[PDB]
Design a protein around this ligand. Structure first.
Ligand code: K
Ligand code: MG
Ligand code: MG
Ligand code: MG
Ligand code: MG
Ligand code: MG
Ligand code: MG
Ligand code: MG
Ligand code: MG
Ligand code: MG
Ligand code: MG
Ligand code: MG
Ligand code: MG
Ligand code: MG
Ligand code: MG
Ligand code: MG
Ligand code: MG
Ligand code: MG
Ligand code: MG
Ligand code: MG
Ligand code: MG
Ligand code: MG
Ligand code: MG
Ligand code: MG
Ligand code: MG
Ligand code: MG
Ligand code: MG
Ligand code: MG
Ligand code: MG
Ligand code: ZN
Lengths: 142, 154, 54, 101, 49, 111, 116
RNA sequence: ACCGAUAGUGAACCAGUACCGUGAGGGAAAGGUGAAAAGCACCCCGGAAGGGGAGUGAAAUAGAACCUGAAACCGUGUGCUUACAAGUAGUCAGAGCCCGUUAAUGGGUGAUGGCGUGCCUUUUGUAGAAUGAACCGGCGAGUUACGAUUUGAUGCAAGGUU
RNA sequence: UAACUUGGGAGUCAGAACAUGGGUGAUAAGGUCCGUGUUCGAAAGGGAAACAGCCCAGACCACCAGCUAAGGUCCCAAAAU
RNA sequence: GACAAUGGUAGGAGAGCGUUCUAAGGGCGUUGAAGCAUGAUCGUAAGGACAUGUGGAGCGCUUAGAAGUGAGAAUGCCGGUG
């Protein structure tokens, strides 16, 4: 009836950049997830990827509250028996923080087809630079 | 029924061991050539009303004809020999409809025959006078004698 | 050793992809050009293989 | 210039020359009906109703007055022998906007 | 009263209750007998007293 | 134009005929003949006789030149069965179905 | 008199299948399976005719909240302000406004901030 | 106000047959060309069956278990779609592509999204790993008589009724 | 705004959890037996992830309308980072 | 018009749709019945019409009556096909 629905050839997927020098990953990843789904647009339409892209930078400098960097643990499993691997959040912050932020945001996104597409719009770098300036991005703050 | 149907008695297969259903006879209703469950049986449907009610039915029917102007009293019938062509000419001269009921004091063989072969026309004699007859009729032709005889019965 | 469920038309047909047979190892016979034959085999018509009747 | 009009228990956004569909109205099939519960007015001249704009209105022309598609109501409760089947054509009234204010 | 205009008096005649002809009747599938008892059987019953 | 020829109550089963028809469908007639005459399946002779019948009665009745022809639709339909019995053990029978086919082959000049 | 059960089974069943038209495999060709999936469709639609309303309401809400956040407000303070001011336009029309023209929505927002 | 070929006789047809059993005994299935046989001269493919044309016929799309000819089932062609995806298989929403109706808020398909554990029975309670059903089609279960009781209807009424 | 009396028709005599007063038990059992009340049975919907019995609340039908209940407002997932 | 009620098993009550036959009446049909198939059709429901293809001879409609009067399940029976 008198409701707008969003469509391909009605969406402008913008690029954003989000620095994370002194910031906690949950209180970052929530905002980022809202951005990625499109919760921050008036043309939000749940069967469409109306959302924007994101580039996370200085992910190696991420902050954890408390003794999480020794007591928070990222358990996972290979489908062989006894296939438990575990990594503390700090050791993963040292080796592969890109993965860390990615998984934190992907647990905060849905687990559907569209949601995985929305996860593919994320880009993470523990450094301070990136390749993706070819598409003239913009800084975002909160 | 299950009992009159030329077979059965043999238990077709055993009660157990097979993966087949329980069965007791090949002529049960669930089967193909099986007997029938209740079905119809021979009967009469004739029932009874009281005498006063049935006489009332006759009076009501005749009153309906006489209110509908389907009552026409003729002096008499006199047919030295039967002739349907002559009787239909009579009915035309009396300006009757197709389907009409005709009444006499007695049999009156000549007129019964002169109207035996016409389809819409039926004949009776005031003691064989029927509700079905005088309602399967758009008109009614009756003699003076038969009219009085009906009058004095009813 | 007994199925619990019937095999749908969909699964039946998805399985009956690779059951087909292929075009044989066919070629022409140059003795007669047409009347295609099997490769590395005699021609039934020409009785030939590398020119020589057989 | 659009407007926002409270009708049929609900609100509708209109344009001059727009064909809408509302509930049934006590009105005939080619006559004129007027909306008086205007709530909003748009365009260059915006003005808000609190609750309504004073005296502003909308005139419109009736086109069809008919019965919608036929949904079938079927309810079902399992292993308790209970079902309903009940049909429904919800009426409507089709209008064709002529003027705002 | 002609044979193509017949009609009884009001409420003389009344239609027979057919039983075991679907659940929408209120007398389908158990036919007013309930579930699983001596009274739920063909010939099922006791003497009156 | 079109020509066809049919073969009804064939003893071979359709699953075993259609394998070959999948090789003929949409090909030059001489090519298709060779496919049938070089394939060692047993339905291929029968398909070949249906085909050559089609080419013959095209050349004869509808007056088309045999060269330009291709096989537009070649389809096989289930016919009857003949129900038979193979005695398996312990008094148990096991059914056998001698299936049948309706080999049809339709020939066109492309117009 | 005898009654062959002719024509009526087949009609009543065909009707069900033509309601089942579009379904997967044997659910559009059989009667039992189609029947029972048709009943499921009925109950599912009965509840979806309700879910639909809740869904679209959440949608309107989400869009309005995004617009207010652009104007540095929340949905809550917005709708409170509109309530106090007294204006009674609904979530649907608000979404449509906020989409079609941002000016009028900003004006509503200023009205609400005045309310507060 | 009986059946109308799963009905009615077990038997509409070469049926108490075929078949089963030592034997007493049990015990089937199986109807329809057309008005008329005028029942496809004749040519082609084929070893034949079978088929294609021609001609009989109103009709062969009636060609011999030859009136009609449903469903399951088997297939051929193609419009939309589908190979990063976790599905009681749908429903509600919904773009895009294709078409154009018992022309009315049109039909098909469905990228994607929310919600969503079959039917029956039996159970305190079943998605149930409790039961039953391979699918399709036909057949298949409160009836009849005789009395009783109550309610409704009508008729006559201290009488009614055979 | 129910009740009672007469008459026609029934079905029900396997109950279940929760909370509570108690027995038995081991101040054990999703135990068992009783009293009281509710829900289910025979009740969908919303919360409790999922879950007859728990909390809110009792579906004639439709609506792309609005206020609320329990429960909730960073993201999944509506709404206070 | 106002006001209210309308979840529901066992179960009780009521109003109905349809099927086969029959009586009466009025009617259709080789310029094409029933039956089958297709459709985007009407009705609050069971269910009813209209068209088109097939088909080739019986069939509805109104009122009333009578029933072999409606099937998704019985390790149901018979046949057909997977
Ligand atoms: K209750
Ligand atoms: Mg006996
Ligand atoms: Mg004995
Ligand atoms: Mg078995
Ligand atoms: Mg019999
Ligand atoms: Mg249900
Ligand atoms: Mg009941
Ligand atoms: Mg049942
Ligand atoms: Mg029972
Ligand atoms: Mg019991
Ligand atoms: Mg009992
Ligand atoms: Mg032996
Ligand atoms: Mg039947
Ligand atoms: Mg027989
Ligand atoms: Mg027959
Ligand atoms: Mg035939
Ligand atoms: Mg893909
Ligand atoms: Mg899962
Ligand atoms: Mg879906
Ligand atoms: Mg099961
Ligand atoms: Mg069956
Ligand atoms: Mg116990
Ligand atoms: Mg119970
Ligand atoms: Mg509120
Ligand atoms: Mg939220
Ligand atoms: Mg209610
Ligand atoms: Mg009720
Ligand atoms: Mg009753
Ligand atoms: Mg019956
Ligand atoms: Zn050669």
């Amino acid at each position: 009836r008198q409701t707008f629905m969003a469509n391909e050839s009605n969406i402008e997927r913008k690029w954003y950049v989000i620095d994370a020098e002194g910031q906690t990953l949950g209180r970052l990843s929530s905002e980022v997830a809202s951005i990625l789904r499109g919760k921050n647009k008036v043309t939000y339409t749940p069967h469409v990827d109306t959302g924007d892209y994101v580039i996370v930078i200085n992910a190696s400098k991420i902050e954890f509250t408390g003794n999480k960097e020794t007591d928070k643990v990222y358990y996972r499993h290979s489908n062989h028996p006894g296939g438990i691997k575990s990594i503390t959040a700090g050791e993963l912050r040292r080796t592969n923080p890109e993965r860390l932020i990615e998984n934190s945001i992907k647990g905060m996104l849905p687990s559907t087809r569209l949601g995985e597409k929305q996860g593919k719009k994320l880009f993470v770098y523990g450094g301070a630079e990136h390749p993706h300036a070819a598409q003239q991005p913009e800084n975002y703050e909160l | 029924n299950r009992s009159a149907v030329s077979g059965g008695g043999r238990k077709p297969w055993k009660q157990k061991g097979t993966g087949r259903a329980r069965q007791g006879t090949i002529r049960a209703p669930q089967w193909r050539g099986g007997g029938i469950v209740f079905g119809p049986t021979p009967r009469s449907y004739a029932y009874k009303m009281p005498k006063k009610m049935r006489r009332l039915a006759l009076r009501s029917a005749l009153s309906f004809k006489a209110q509908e102007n389907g009552l026409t009293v003729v002096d008499a019938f006199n047919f030295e020999a039967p002739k349907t062509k002559e009787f239909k000419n009579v009915l035309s001269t009396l300006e009757q409809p197709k389907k009409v009921l005709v009444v006499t004091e007695n049999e009156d063989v000549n007129v019964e025959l002169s109207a035996r072969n016409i389809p819409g026309v039926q004949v009776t004699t005031a003691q064989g006078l029927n509700v079905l007859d005088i309602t399967n009729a758009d008109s009614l032709v009756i003699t003076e004698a038969a009219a009085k005889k009906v009058e004095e019965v009813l | 050793a007994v199925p619990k469920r019937r095999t749908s038309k969909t699964r039946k047909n998805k399985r009956r992809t690779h059951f087909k047979i292929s075009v044989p190892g066919m070629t022409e016979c140059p003795n007669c050009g047409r009347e295609y034959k099997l490769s590395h085999r005699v021609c039934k018509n020409c009785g030939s293989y590398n020119g020589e009747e057989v | 210039m659009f407007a926002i009009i409270e009708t049929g228990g609900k609100q509708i956004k209109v344009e001059e020359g727009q064909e809408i569909f509302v509930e049934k109205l006590d009105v005939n099939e080619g006559d004129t009906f007027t909306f008086d519960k205007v709530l909003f007015v748009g365009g260059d001249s915006v003005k808000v109703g609190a609750p309504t704009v004073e005296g502003a209105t909308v005139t419109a022309t009736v086109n069809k007055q008919g019965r919608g598609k036929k949904i079938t109501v079927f309810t079902y409760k399992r292993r308790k022998n209970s079902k309903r089947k009940k049909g429904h054509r919800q009426p409507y009234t089709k209008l064709t906007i002529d003027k705002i204010n | 009263m002609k044979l193509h205009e017949l009609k009884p008096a009001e409420g003389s005649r009344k239609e027979r209750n057919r039983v075991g002809r679907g659940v929408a009747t209120g007398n389908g599938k158990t036919s007013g007998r309930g579930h699983k008892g001596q009274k739920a059987r063909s010939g099922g019953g006791v003497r009156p007293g | 134009m079109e020509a066809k020829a049919v073969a009804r109550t064939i003893r071979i089963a359709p699953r075993k005929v259609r394998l070959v028809l999948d090789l003929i469908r949409g090909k030059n007639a001489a090519e298709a003949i060779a496919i049938l005459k070089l394939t060692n399946k047993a339905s291929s002779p029968v398909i070949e006789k249906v085909l050559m019948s089609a080419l013959a009665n095209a050349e004869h009745n509808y007056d088309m030149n045999t060269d330009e022809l291709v096989v537009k639709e070649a389809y096989a339909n289930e016919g009857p069965t003949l129900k038979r019995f193979r005695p398996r053990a312990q008094g148990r029978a096991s059914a056998i179905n001698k299936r049948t086919s309706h080999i049809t082959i339709v020939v066109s000049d492309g117009k | 008199p005898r009654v062959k059960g002719g024509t009526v089974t087949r009609a009543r069943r065909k009707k069900t299948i033509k309601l089942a038209k579009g379904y997967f495999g044997s659910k559009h060709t059989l009667y039992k399976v189609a029947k029972q999936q048709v009943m499921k469709s009925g109950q599912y639609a009965f509840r979806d005719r309700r879910q639909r309303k809740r869904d679209f309401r959440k949608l309107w809400i989400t869009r309005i909240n995004a617009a207010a956040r652009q104007h540095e407000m929340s949905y809550s303070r917005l709708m409170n302000g509109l309530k106090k001011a007294g204006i009674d336009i609904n979530r649907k029309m608000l979404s449509e406004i906020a989409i079609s023209d941002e000016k009028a929505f900003a004006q509503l927002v200023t009205k609400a901030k005045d309310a507060l």
